[PDB]
Every structure is written in C-alpha cells, then in structure tokens.
Amino acid sequence: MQDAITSVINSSDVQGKYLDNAALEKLKGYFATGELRVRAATTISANAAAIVKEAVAKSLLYSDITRPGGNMYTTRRYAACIRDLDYYLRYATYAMLAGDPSILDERVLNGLKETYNSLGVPVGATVQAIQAIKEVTASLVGPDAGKEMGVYFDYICSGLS
Amino acid sequence: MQDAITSVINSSDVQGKYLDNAALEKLKGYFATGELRVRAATTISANAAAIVKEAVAKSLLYSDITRPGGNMYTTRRYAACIRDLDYYLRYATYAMLAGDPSILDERVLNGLKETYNSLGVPVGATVQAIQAIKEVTASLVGPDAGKEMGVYFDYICSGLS
Amino acid sequence: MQDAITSVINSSDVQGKYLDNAALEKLKGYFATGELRVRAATTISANAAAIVKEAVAKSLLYSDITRPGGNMYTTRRYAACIRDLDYYLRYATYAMLAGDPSILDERVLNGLKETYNSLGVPVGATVQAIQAIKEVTASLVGPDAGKEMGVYFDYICSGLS
Amino acid sequence: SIVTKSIVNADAEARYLSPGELDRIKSFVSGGAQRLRIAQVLTDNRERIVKQAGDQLFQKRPDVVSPGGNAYGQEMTATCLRDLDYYLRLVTYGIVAGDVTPIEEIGIVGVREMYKSLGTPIDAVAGGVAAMKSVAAGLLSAEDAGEAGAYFDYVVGAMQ
Amino acid sequence: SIVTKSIVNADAEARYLSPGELDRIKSFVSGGAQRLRIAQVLTDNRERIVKQAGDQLFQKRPDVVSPGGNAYGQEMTATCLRDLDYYLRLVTYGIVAGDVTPIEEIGIVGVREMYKSLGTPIDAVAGGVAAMKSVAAGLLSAEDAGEAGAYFDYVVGAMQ
Amino acid sequence: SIVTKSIVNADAEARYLSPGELDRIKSFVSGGAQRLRIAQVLTDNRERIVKQAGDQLFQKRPDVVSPGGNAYGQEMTATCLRDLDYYLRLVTYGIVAGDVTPIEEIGIVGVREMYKSLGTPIDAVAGGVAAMKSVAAGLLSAEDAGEAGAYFDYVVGAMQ
Numbered sequence: 011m012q013d014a015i016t017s018v019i020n021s022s023d024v025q026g027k028y029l030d031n032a033a034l035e036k037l038k039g040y041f042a043t044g045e046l047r048v049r050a051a052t053t054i055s056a057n058a059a060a061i062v063k064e065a066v067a068k069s070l071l072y073s074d075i076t077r078p079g080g081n082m083y084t085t086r087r088y089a090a091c092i093r094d095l096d097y098y099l100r101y102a103t104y105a106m107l108a109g110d111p112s113i114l115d116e117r118v119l120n121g122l123k124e125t126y127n128s129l130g131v132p133v134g135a136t137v138q139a140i141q142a143i144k145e146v147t148a149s150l151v152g153p154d155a156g157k158e159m160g161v162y163f164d165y166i167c168s169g170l171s
Numbered sequence: 172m173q174d175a176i177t178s179v180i181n182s183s184d185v186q187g188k189y190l191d192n193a194a195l196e197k198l199k200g201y202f203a204t205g206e207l208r209v210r211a212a213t214t215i216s217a218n219a220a221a222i223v224k225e226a227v228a229k230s231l232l233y234s235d236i237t238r239p240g241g242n243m244y245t246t247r248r249y250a251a252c253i254r255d256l257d258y259y260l261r262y263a264t265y266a267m268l269a270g271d272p273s274i275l276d277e278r279v280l281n282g283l284k285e286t287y288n289s290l291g292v293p294v295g296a297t298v299q300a301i302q303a304i305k306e307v308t309a310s311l312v313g314p315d316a317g318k319e320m321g322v323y324f325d326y327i328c329s330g331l332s
Numbered sequence: 333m334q335d336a337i338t339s340v341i342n343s344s345d346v347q348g349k350y351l352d353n354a355a356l357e358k359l360k361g362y363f364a365t366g367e368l369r370v371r372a373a374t375t376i377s378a379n380a381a382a383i384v385k386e387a388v389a390k391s392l393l394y395s396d397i398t399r400p401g402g403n404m405y406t407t408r409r410y411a412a413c414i415r416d417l418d419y420y421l422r423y424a425t426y427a428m429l430a431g432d433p434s435i436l437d438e439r440v441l442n443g444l445k446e447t448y449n450s451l452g453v454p455v456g457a458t459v460q461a462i463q464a465i466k467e468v469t470a471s472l473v474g475p476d477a478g479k480e481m482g483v484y485f486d487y488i489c490s491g492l493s
Numbered sequence: 494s495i496v497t498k499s500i501v502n503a504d505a506e507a508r509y510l511s512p513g514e515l516d517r518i519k520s521f522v523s524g525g526a527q528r529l530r531i532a533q534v535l536t537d538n539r540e541r542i543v544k545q546a547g548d549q550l551f552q553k554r555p556d557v558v559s560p561g562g563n564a565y566g567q568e569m570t571a572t573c574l575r576d577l578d579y580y581l582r583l584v585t586y587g588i589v590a591g592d593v594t595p596i597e598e599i600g601i602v603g604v605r606e607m608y609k610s611l612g613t614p615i616d617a618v619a620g621g622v623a624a625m626k627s628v629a630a631g632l633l634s635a636e637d638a639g640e641a642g643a644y645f646d647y648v649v650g651a652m653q
Numbered sequence: 654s655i656v657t658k659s660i661v662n663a664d665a666e667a668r669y670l671s672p673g674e675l676d677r678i679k680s681f682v683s684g685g686a687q688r689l690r691i692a693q694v695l696t697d698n699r700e701r702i703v704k705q706a707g708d709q710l711f712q713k714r715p716d717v718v719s720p721g722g723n724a725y726g727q728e729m730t731a732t733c734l735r736d737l738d739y740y741l742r743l744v745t746y747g748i749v750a751g752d753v754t755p756i757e758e759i760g761i762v763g764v765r766e767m768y769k770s771l772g773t774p775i776d777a778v779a780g781g782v783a784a785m786k787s788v789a790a791g792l793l794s795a796e797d798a799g800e801a802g803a804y805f806d807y808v809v810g811a812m813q
Numbered sequence: 814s815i816v817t818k819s820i821v822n823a824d825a826e827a828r829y830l831s832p833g834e835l836d837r838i839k840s841f842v843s844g845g846a847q848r849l850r851i852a853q854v855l856t857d858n859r860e861r862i863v864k865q866a867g868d869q870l871f872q873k874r875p876d877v878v879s880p881g882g883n884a885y886g887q888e889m890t891a892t893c894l895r896d897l898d899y900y901l902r903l904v905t906y907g908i909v910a911g912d913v914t915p916i917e918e919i920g921i922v923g924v925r926e927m928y929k930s931l932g933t934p935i936d937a938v939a940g941g942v943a944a945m946k947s948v949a950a951g952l953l954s955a956e957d958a959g960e961a962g963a964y965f966d967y968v969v970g971a972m973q
C-alpha cells in the first residue's frame with residue numbers, strides 16, 4: 011500500500027527528482043490534517059460495533075433480505091454480512107488515516123466482486139448498507155471527516171461494480 | 172452436499188414453513204425404501220476391492236491400455252487408474268445412500284473432465300470401466316439395487332463427457 | 333526432466349523394447365561427448381559472475397532501462413534482473429550437460445512469460461541480454477561448445493516469445 | 494441429516510460407512526414415521542408452545558420487556574416471540590433429520606455475532622428455548638419428549 | 654540417469670555441479686561402452702534368464718503355481734514370466750543410465766497397489782527378480798555381475 | 814512512513830490502530846514542518862554536498878580513482894558522483910517519511926548484489942555516504958544533524 015507521503019515520494023523517485031515546491035506543498039497538506047485524521051479514527055474505533063448496528067437497522071432489517079429465502083437469512087449469513095460491514099468500516103478508516111485508497115485495492119477489492127458473484131451476495135443491497143455506514147459515520151465524526159470517509163466508502167462501492 | 176431429507180428441509184426453510192403434507196409425503200418416500208439403500212451399501216463396502224478387481228479384469232486388462240504406450244502402462248498409472256475406480260465406487264455408494272447426486276458434483280466431477288483431458292487419460296476407456304463396475308456391482312446387490320447404483324455411475328460418466 | 337540417456341530409455345519403454353542397435357549407438361554418441369560437456373560446464377561455472385557482468389554491460393547498462401522509470405531502476409530490480417540472468421546461465425549449463433532441453437520447460441519456462449507480463453518485465457530486453465550471454469559464453473568455451481550452449485539459450489528465448 | 498453426517502465423517506477418513514454407522518441409519522429409517530408424528534405435534538401446537546414459553550421467560554426476565562430492555566414495546570416483544578417460533582421450526586427439522594445439522598446450519602453458526610450486534614441477551618433467548626422444551630414435553634409421551642428434548646437441549650447448549 | 658541425478662541435487666542447492674559430481678560423470682561416460690555390452694548380453698540372453706529364474710522361483714514358492722496361487726495354470730504362469738521380462742528390461746535401462754530412477758518411474762511407484770489389486774504376492778515377485786540376478790550373474794564377469802546385481806537388488810528391496 | 818507501518822501492523826492482527834500507534838502518528842505529523850525544512854536544506858545544497866563528499870572520499874580512497882579503480886577516469890568519476898546524488902535524494906525521502914523504508918526499497922535491497930556485479934567497492938560507496946553526512950551536518954543545527962545523521966548512518970550500516 012502507499013499513504014499520502016509515499017505517493018509523493020514515489021512520484022518524485024520515478025522522475026529521478028528531489029522533492030520540488032509542488033511535492034513539499036502536498037506533504038504540508040497531509041501533515042496539516044494528520045491530527046484530524048487521528049481524531050476521526052479514534053472516534054470510529056470506539057464506536058465501530060454501534061456504527062454497523064445502526065447502519066444495519068436503517069438499511070437491511072425487517073425486509074425480504076432477512077426473511078426466509080433472503081441473502082441475510084440464517085445466522086451464518088447474518089454474521090458473514092455484518093463481518094463484511096466491520097471490514098469495510100475498518101479498511102475505510104485505514105485508508106482515511108493514510109489519505110490514500112491503495113490499501114482498498116490491495117486488501118479489500120482484489121477478487122471481491124468475483125467472490126460475491128460466485129456466492130450470490132447482492133451488490134445493490136451491500137452498496138445500500140455501505141451508504142448507511144457512510145451517513146451514520148458522518149453523524150459521529152462531523153461533516154469534513156464524514157466527506158473524507160465517504161470518498162473511501164464510495165471507492166469500496168465502485169469496486170463492487 | 173444435500174440428501175433426500177435435507178432437500179425437503181431446505182425447500183421448507185427457504186419459504187419459512189414448517190413441514191407441510193407434501194414435504195412429509197416426500198420424507199415418507201425416502202423412509203419407505205431407505206433400508207434397501209443401507210443393505211446395498213453394506214454389500215458394496217464388504218466387496219469394494221473385489222468389485223474393482225473384477226471390473227478391471229473384464230474391461231481393461233490384456234489390451235493396448237495396459238501394454239507399453241497405453242495410458243495404464245507403468246505401475247504409477249496402473250495404481251492411479253484403480254484408485255480412480257475406487258473413488259467412483261465409494262462416491263456412487265455415498266450418492267445412492269443420500270438418494271441425491273450433489274456429492275458427485277461437489278467432490279468428484281468439478282474439473283475432472285479438464286484434468287483427464289490435460290493428462291491424456293482416455294475418457295472412453297474410463298466410461299467402459301465404469302460400465303463394468305456397474306455390471307459387477309449389480310451381480311452382488313441384485314438387479315433393482317444395481318439399477319439405482321447405475322443412476323449414479325451414469326451421472327459420473329455423463330460428467331466426464 | 334529427461335537427459336540424452338533417459339530420452340533413449342523413454343523411447344524404448346513406450347514401444348516395450350529392450351535397447352536395440354539404434355538405441356545403443358545413440359547412447360554411445362552421447363557418452364563420446366560427455367567429457368566435452370563437462371569441460372564446457374567447468375569453464376562456465378568458474379566464470380559465471382563475469383559472463384553475466386559482461387552481458388549486462390553490452391546489452392542493458394547506461395540506457396532508459398537502468399534510469400528512473402526503467403525496469404532495472406532501484407537496487408531491488410537491478411538485483412532481481414541479474415539473478416534471472418544467473419538462473420538462465422545455470423539452467424542452460426544443466427541442459428547442455430543433459431543434452432536435452434526438457435529441464436528448461438519444467439524448471440524455467442512454465443508460466444515465465446505470463447509472470448514477466450503481469451509484473452511489467454520487458455521480455456525483448458531480457459532476450460537481448462540472453463543473446464549477449466550466448467556470445468560471451470561462446471568466447472570462453474569455444475565454437476562447438478558455444479553453438480551447443482546457444483541451442484539452450486535460443487530455447488529459453490523462444491519460450492519467452 | 495444423520496445420512497449426510499455419516500457420509501461426511503466417512504469421506505473425511507477416505508472410507509465406506511462402518512457397519513455401526515449403517516446400523517444407526519437403519520434404526521433412523523425404521524423410526525422415521527414416529528419422527529414425523531413428533532414434528533406434527535410441535536407444528537400443530539406452535540401457538541401454545543411459543544406463547545406459554547414467552548410468558549415463562551418474561552416472568553423470570555421481566556427486565557427484557559422493561560424500558561431499556563431489547564424486547565421492550567409491543568413490536569419488539571412480537572419479534573422476540575417470532576424468534577422463538579423460528580427455533581421451534583428448526584427443532585422440527587432436526588427431529589425428522591435425526592441429526593442437529595439443519596439447526597446448526599440455519600440457526601446456530603454465527604448466532605452469538607447476530608444477537609450481540611442486535612443487543613439481544615442470548616442467555617434469555619436460551620431461557621425461551623428451554624421454556625418451549627418444558628411446554629412441548631407436556632404434549633408428548635415420555636419417550637417422544639426425550640427425543641424432542643435432545644434437540645431443544647442442543648439449541649440451549651449451543652447458546653450458553 | 655547419473656547426469657539427471659547430479660543436476661537435480663545441484664538445482665536443490667541452487668548451485669552448479671560440484672567438481673566431484675562432474676568427475677563422476679566423466680568416469681561414468683568413460684566406462685560407457687562396457688555398460689552397453691552388459692545391457693546387450695542380458696538382452697541377448699533374456700529368454701534364458703526369465704525361463705531359468707521362473708523355474709527357480711516356482712521350486713522355492715510352489716504356492717504361486719499350486720491351486721489358489723496367483724500364477725496357477727499355463728496362462729497365468731505365462732503372464733508371470735512376462736512380468737519378469739518387464740523387470741529384466743527395466744534393469745538393462747538402469748545399467749546404461751548409472752541410476753535407478755528409470756526403474757523407479759516405470760516399475761516401482763505404485764507397484765504395491767497394482768500387485769495387491771491383482772492378488773499377486775509381491776514377496777514372490779521380488780523372489781523372481783532375485784532369481785534373475787543369480788542367472789544373469791552367471792553370464793557376466795565378476796565386476797559386471799556386481800554392477801548388474803546392484804540394479805536387481807534395488808528392485809528386490811523396493812518390493813519388500 | 815510510520816503511518817503505513819502502523820496500518821500494516823494493525824491489518825496483520827485484524828484490528829484498529831492501538832492508542833500507541835495513533836500517538837506515534839500524531840507525534841510524527843506534529844514534527845512534519847521541521848522534517849520538510851531539513852529536506853529543503855539538503856535539497857538546496859545537493860551540488861555542494863555531493864562534490865565535497867566526492868573530494869573527501871577520493872582523498873581517503875585514491876585507489877578508486879587510480880588506474881584499475883572502478884571510478885577511474887572522467888566518465889566513471891561522474892557516474893560515481895551520480896550514485897552519491899542518488900543516495901542524498903533517497904536520504905531526503907527518508908527524512909520526510911520519518912523512517913528508512915523509502916531508502917531500503919529504492920537503494921538498499923539488492924545493493925550488495927548490484928555493486929558486486931559492477932565491480933564497485935561497496936565500502937568506498939559507504940565512505941562517500943559517510944562523507945555526505947559530515948558535510949550536511951555543517952548546514953544544520955545539532956538537533957537537525959542528529960535526525961538527518963540517523964538516515965545517512967542507516968545507509969552506511971546497510972552497506973557493511
């Protein structure tokens with residue numbers, strides 16, 4: 011994976027260049043936000059089970075998806091689905107700390123669509139649950155942190171298409 | 172895998188239903204003749220090595236297949252071939268007890284044709300050996316149990332075709 | 333793998349034949365070359381690092397390939413590349429001792445092009461480096477040994493194409 | 494079912510069913526009609542079994558239907574009794590199958606994870622299933638109650 | 654062959670052949686004509702070697718050519734001698750190769766499974782190969798019999 | 814950086830960052846402006862740092878710029894100073910990252926294998942990098958020289 015710092019270094023290194031004014035400005039941009047990323051990560055980590063619970067209650071429960079025949083029916087599938095939502099929240103939080111989505115390509119999305127397609131896991135309902143996680147997270151971390159987390163939630167959703 | 176019993180349970184569970192008259196009639200269908208499946212399985216298990224030996228003697232031995240240049244020449248290939256016939260008999264017997272061919276799709280047939288084709292294992296001669304196993308099995312378990320076993324042997328042969 | 337001896341044995345065995353006049357004459361032909369193969373192998377072994385160094389200096393250095401943005405930039409990629417050339421020289425020397433290219437198919441070429449293609453390793457540049465290894469090797473082992481080594485270097489190159 | 498479980502156990506040791514496994518299957522099939530009759534009694538009496546089990550549970554754990562409790566309010570109480578009806582249904586499946594596999598695969602794998610996310614006290618769910626066993630036992634012969642009771646006991650033990 | 658064996662050993666330690674491995678190859682190929690003459694003499698005498706070894710085996714293991722025996726009757730006896738002819742052929746391959754791997758790959762991997770399926774007592778097959786060694790030895794110099802004998806002994810040991 | 818390292822550690826144990834990992838990130842980013850200023854000094858003075866380090870190395874190791882030496886002659890001496898300029902650039906990357914990973918991944922993994930193939934004396938390369946540290950230290954506060962010095966020291970130590 012890369013973070014916002016290693017991304018700038020990699021871009022300079024492939025050119026054989028010392029960090030120029032544009033590179034140093036990009037690094038300053040990341041350093042200026044670092045404590046705000048740590049604050050958002052602390053809040054999410056402390057509330058991670060509660061964020062998933064509220065998102066599930068707003069987007070999936072009391073529907074055909076949890077009723078007999080639905081993809082979230084059976085305790086095994088209920089548990090797999092909320093485990094997946096715990097993964098999306100934890101990896102989106104990593105990506106937000108890094109200020110870079112590369113961890114999502116490497117550790118979340120690689121073969122995920124093909125796995126969902128082989129098992130019959132519904133992508134549309136998964137994207138609705140991720141959208142609920144995005145909105146519940148935003149309610150706790152504030153609009154700025156919520157929009158930044160939303161970039162990474164949207165990146166996961168797009169990777170399922 | 173599923174058996175005759177779990178197929179009925181799964182069909183009731185996907186509808187959220189307790190077992191209705193139609194489901195109970197299907198379960199009675201399995202219970203009515205289940206002891207005949209157990210009897211045939213007892214006879215096959217007690218005679219498994221002898222069934223494969225006689226089938227090989229009738230269908231493969233003293234031919235171009237076991238002579239230099241045939242696919243059963245070399246002790247390694249001879250042993251792999253009779254191991255494959257032991258697998259077909261053991262799995263066909265499981266499927267017959269279950270009254271369901273799903274174990275064959277999951278544990279025998281998945282990528283089997285492609286494997287044989289990549290190695291140059293002759294499918295025609297394999298189907299002839301399976302036909303000999305069907306006839307030798309029938310001679311021991313009787314014509315009616317022999318026909319039921321033949322359903323599962325034919326399922327394996329079709330999966331190679 | 334096979335060598336020139338097991339090639340004759342394998343050809344006799346697939347026909348069910350004891351070694352005939354042609355088989356014994358072919359084995360004599362290989363035994364008569366054995367000391368010349370061992371001589372060439374001893375010279376290559378003693379000069380293995382120097383052969384790769386000279387081949388690299390003639391085919392890869394001071395180009396876009398070693399500069400930032402080229403595939404040999406970074407010490408890790410430089411080292412992986414000369415390790416691959418060490419492998420080609422060592423395996424070509426094995427194939428020459430054996431008088432048979434089968435070790436190349438089994439231990440070098442199986443999925444190699446696909447691996448290079450997935451990593452972005454330039455195959456054209458690799459084949460040019462192998463061609464330089466062929467010419468440097470020939471200068472040390474003499475024209476007859478150089479031609480025999482060139483059969484195996486050409487075999488690796490063709491397998492990468 | 495006992496058939497699939499015997500096959501899976503034999504397949505894991507690359508062997509035929511033992512004569513002991515085959516004898517258990519023969520015994521299962523021979524009692525098959527009696528297993529269907531037990532399932533039919535639980536099916537026919539499901540309203541009584543669930544309602545009376547609910548009443549017993551809420552007498553021992555009135556906290557779960559008090560303010561702050563997971564089952565507080567008409568709608569959450571109804572959902573609680575729906576879950577007991579789900580477990581009674583799975584117990585009927587286990588009884589006809591002669592093995593806990595259908596119960597395990599539908600209602601036990603991941604059960605702790607589900608109820609923990611929902612905030613449901615799983616010790617009180619287990620208490621509701623134990624209550625259903627006692628009500629069901631009142632509708633059956635001693636022999637039939639012993640057989641049905643083993644499946645109730647499996648659910649209670651898997652939630653503890 | 655001795656060449657493949659040296660290469661496989663070198664490859665497993667990511668190295669060129671040792672000076673010792675290369676010296677063994679030079680010594681082997683220098684003796685190559687003498688090894689080919691051993692193979693030619695055993696080939697020229699194959700009918701004699703197999704027939705006389707068969708007679709020795711059947712004298713010491715009368716069970717295999719008696720009622721119930723795997724080789725009982727003219728046709729099964731003939732098939733038994735065919736198998737001894739197979740193993741004599743593989744022994745000539747090992748002798749010219751300087752290594753048992755050609756024998757192992759054609760006639761040893763899976764040999765217990767094959768003979769167990771056929772009902773052939775593999776200790777009697779080993780006895781027949783040991784008999785061929787003693788007959789073959791009578792047609793060779795002491796040095797040549799010692800070399801040939803090592804290949805027969807490998808087969809006998811791999812069947813025990 | 815320390816950010817990637819903390820995340821990779823957390824990911825390997827399937828957990829959120831520990832409070833200790835989060836505190837390391839907060840400490841790192843708070844020192845960010847100081848790290849950028851150190852990188853800017855080395856970047857602005859790169860010509861001086863490389864040229865003067867080169868002169869010091871060639872005075873300690875005149876053999877590398879004498880006949881038979883790897884850097885002998887105008888063209889090879891220029892390539893030698895190009896390599897020192899590479900290492901100064903990587904040191905600036907390490908300083909902004911707060912750890913050695915960019916230096917390791919670009920210029921240390923495989924470095925002994927590269928220089929061995931080229932015939933370059935890697936103890937003299939290490940000497941050149943040590944010289945750059947001593948020239949750079951003359952342009953920095955004691956505190957800044959201590960921080961920058963750790964990155965030069967990492968390169969020197971990794972080439973022994």
Ligand SMILES: *[C@H](C)[C@H]1C(Cc2[nH]c(Cc3[nH]c(/C=C4\NC(=O)C(CC)=C4C)c(C)c3CCC(=O)O)c(CCC(=O)O)c2C)=NC(=O)[C@@H]1C
Pocket residue numbers: 075080081082086087088090091092094095097117118122125129131132135136139
């Ligand atoms: C929840 C909103 C929706 C589901 C989810 C659901 N997923 C699965 C199976 C599943 N999910 C994953 C995902 C990951 N594994 C990882 O290690 C990572 C990397 C961080 C991810 C993203 C995998 C690999 C699998 C398959 C293997 C497994 O079970 O662990 C299931 C189970 C399907 C089944 O087996 O039938 C379900 C139910 N389902 C819904 O209906 C929701 C919309």
Ligand SMILES: *[C@H](C)[C@H]1C(Cc2[nH]c(Cc3[nH]c(/C=C4\NC(=O)C(CC)=C4C)c(C)c3CCC(=O)O)c(CCC(=O)O)c2C)=NC(=O)[C@@H]1C
Pocket residue numbers: 236241242243247248249251252253255256258278279283286290292293296297300
């Ligand atoms: C016998 C009637 C015919 C053969 C058979 C033959 N098969 C193979 C290799 C082989 N077979 C399988 C099959 C299975 N493996 C499994 O695990 C299962 C599921 C239980 C099955 C059905 C596999 C996977 C393979 C390849 C790997 C292996 O060898 O174990 C060979 C060997 C070919 C070779 O390597 O040269 C042979 C000879 N040959 C005939 O001529 C008969 C008609």
Ligand SMILES: *[C@H](C)[C@H]1C(Cc2[nH]c(Cc3[nH]c(/C=C4\NC(=O)C(CC)=C4C)c(C)c3CCC(=O)O)c(CCC(=O)O)c2C)=NC(=O)[C@@H]1C
Pocket residue numbers: 397402403404408409410412413414416417419439440444447451453454457458461
């Ligand atoms: C040098 C002439 C050219 C390169 C080479 C280059 N190769 C690789 C990675 C690499 N190469 C191999 C090859 C083999 N591994 C084996 O075990 C064998 C058989 C003995 C061979 C032939 C592999 C499998 C791999 C990938 C895994 C690994 O790194 O070991 C790289 C590294 C790519 C990277 O990860 O960035 C390079 C640079 N590059 C050029 O530009 C030259 C033309």
Ligand SMILES: *[C@H](C)[C@H]1C(Cc2[nH]c(Cc3[nH]c(/C=C4\NC(=O)C(CC)=C4C)c(C)c3CCC(=O)O)c(CCC(=O)O)c2C)=NC(=O)[C@@H]1C
Pocket residue numbers: 070071072073076077082083084085088557562563564565569570572573574576577579580599600611613614617618621
């Ligand atoms: C009653 C004894 C206890 C409760 C129960 C309770 N459950 C729920 C929600 C609920 N329960 C399930 C259950 C299952 N899904 C399955 O696939 C299976 C296996 C067959 C079961 C058992 C689900 C899925 C849900 C979510 C709602 C939905 O159906 O989508 C609630 C409601 C909680 C809420 O919404 O806040 C309650 C009250 N609560 C207690 O306190 C009793 C001990």
Ligand SMILES: *[C@H](C)[C@H]1C(Cc2[nH]c(Cc3[nH]c(/C=C4\NC(=O)C(CC)=C4C)c(C)c3CCC(=O)O)c(CCC(=O)O)c2C)=NC(=O)[C@@H]1C
Pocket residue numbers: 231232233234237238243244245246249717722723724729730732733734736737739740759760771773774777778781
């Ligand atoms: C003689 C010393 C002992 C016997 C031998 C015996 N063998 C057989 C049948 C037989 N054996 C083979 C052997 C091989 N196939 C290979 O690929 C190789 C490697 C080169 C060998 C050694 C085969 C394949 C067969 C099957 C027949 C065929 O050729 O297709 C028999 C016949 C048994 C039967 O048909 O009932 C016998 C008698 N028997 C003894 O008792 C001696 C100890």
Ligand SMILES: *[C@H](C)[C@H]1C(Cc2[nH]c(Cc3[nH]c(/C=C4\NC(=O)C(CC)=C4C)c(C)c3CCC(=O)O)c(CCC(=O)O)c2C)=NC(=O)[C@@H]1C
Pocket residue numbers: 392393394395398399404405406407410877882883884885889890892893894896897899900919920931933934937938941
């Ligand atoms: C100077 C302190 C010492 C030298 C240096 C020297 N180097 C070379 C050749 C050379 N160096 C590299 C270096 C790198 N490639 C990378 O990717 C990195 C990581 C950023 C490094 C450090 C390469 C690739 C090469 C080969 C030429 C090319 O650029 O393609 C030479 C030339 C040697 C020759 O051609 O004979 C020299 C002189 N020499 C000394 O003696 C000093 C101690």
